[PDB]
C-alpha cells in the first residue's frame, strides 16, 4: 500500500510597531516582526518530522536574506519597514519526504500602539510517508 499521513504546517507572523522614540538613529525600521513555522495544537509537535526550515527574505535584507533554523522553535525575528512574501522551505528528517516551499505574505501591525498583534497565517497540509 501507498500509506501516508497528513500533517498541518502553519506559517504565520506577528509584529509590533516601534515608535520613533525607541528607534535608533538612521534605522528605517518601523516594526519588529517574527515569522513562525509550527504544527497545529491538535496533532503532534513538528520537531518529530521537520529537520530544518529555510527563510528566504526580500533582497533588502542582504547579505542576511537567507536564514536557516535547524532546531525548534522555527522562528525568525527581524526589524523592518515593509511587507513582502516570505518564502519558507521546510526540510524533513526522513529525506523520503521532499522539501516543501510555502509563501507567506508578511502582515505588519497597523494599530501602532507598540503592542504585538497577530498578522497573518498561511496553513498547508503536508503528506509524510508512513
Amino acid at each position: 500500500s501507498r500509506l501516508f499521513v497528513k500533517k498541518t504546517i502553519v506559517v504565520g507572523n506577528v509584529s509590533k510597531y516601534i515608535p520613533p522614540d525607541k528607534r535608533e538613529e538612521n534605522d528605517q525600521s518601523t516594526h519588529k516582526w517574527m515569522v513562525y513555522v509550527r504544527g497545529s495544537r491538535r496533532e503532534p509537535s513538528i520537531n518529530h518530522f521537520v529537520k530544518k526550515v529555510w527563510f528566504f527574505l526580500h533582497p533588502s535584507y542582504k547579505p542576511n536574506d537567507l536564514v536557516e533554523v535547524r532546531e525548534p522553535p522555527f522562528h525568525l525575528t527581524r526589524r523592518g519597514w515593509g511587507e513582502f512574501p516570505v518564502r519558507v522551505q521546510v526540510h524533513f528528517k526522513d529525506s523520503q519526504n521532499k522539501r516543501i516551499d510555502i509563501i507567506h505574505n508578511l502582515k505588519l501591525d497597523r494599530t501602532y500602539t507598540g503592542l504585538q498583534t497577530l498578522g497573518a497565517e498561511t496553513v498547508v497540509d503536508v503528506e509524510l510517508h508512513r
Binding site: 526580500h58 519597514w81 511587507e83
Partner: peptide
C-alpha cells in the same frame, strides 16, 4: 521583481 511595501 522582488517587491516590498510599507503598510502606511
Amino acid at each position: 521583481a522582488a517587491r516590498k511595501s510599507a503598510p502606511a
